[PDB]
């Protein structure tokens, strides 16, 4: 019983370190605009207005 | 004289500067850069 206890708790503690990268991928996908729309605006208009 | 980081290229027999000044000047301002001139056909 205590062996199953420790073996289970180890992967539960590992899962947060494993899923922080998942959350960064989620937020970086929710943040990034497409390159095909970012790159002409950064170039073809000089300043704006 | 003073040392300045600037690139020089050689064409023909003449050593010329090569300038594309758009990041140092004409950046984060409200003016239009020249050499983006217009033509009429």
Least CA distance to A44: which residue of chain B? B36
Task: Please state how this structure was obtained.
Answer: cryo-EM
Number of H-type helices and E-type strands within chain A = 2, 0
| Angle (nearest 5°) at CA B5 between B30 and B1 | 110
Contact in structure between B22 and A42 (CB atoms under 8 Å)? no
Beta strands B14-17; B8-11: pairing state: antiparallel
Resolution (A): 3.1
- Residue B16 phi/psi, 5° resolution? -120, 155
Closest CA to A47 of B41, B19, B38, B29: B29
Is A46 in Cβ contact with B32 (below 8 Å)?
yes
- Indicate the length of chain B as a whole number: 41
Q: Cα–Cα distances in Å, from B19 out to A8, A35, B10, B24? A: 64, 28, 13, 11
Instruction: Compute the nearest-CA separation of B2 from chain A (Å).
Output: 32
Burial of A10 (0-12, 13-18, 19+ CB in 10 A): exposed
């Amino acid at each position: 019983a205590i062996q199953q206890m420790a073996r289970n708790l180890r992967t539960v503690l590992d899962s947060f370190e494993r899923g922080t990268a998942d959350q960064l991928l989620g937020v970086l996908l929710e943040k990034a605009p497409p390159l095909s729309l970012l790159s002409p605006i950064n170039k073809f208009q000089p300043e704006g207005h | 004289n003073a040392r300045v980081p600037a690139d020089l290229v050689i064409v023909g027999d003449k050593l010329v500067f090569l300038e594309a000044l758009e990041r140092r000047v004409y950046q984060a301002t409200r003016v239009a850069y020249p050499l983006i001139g217009n033509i009429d056909i």
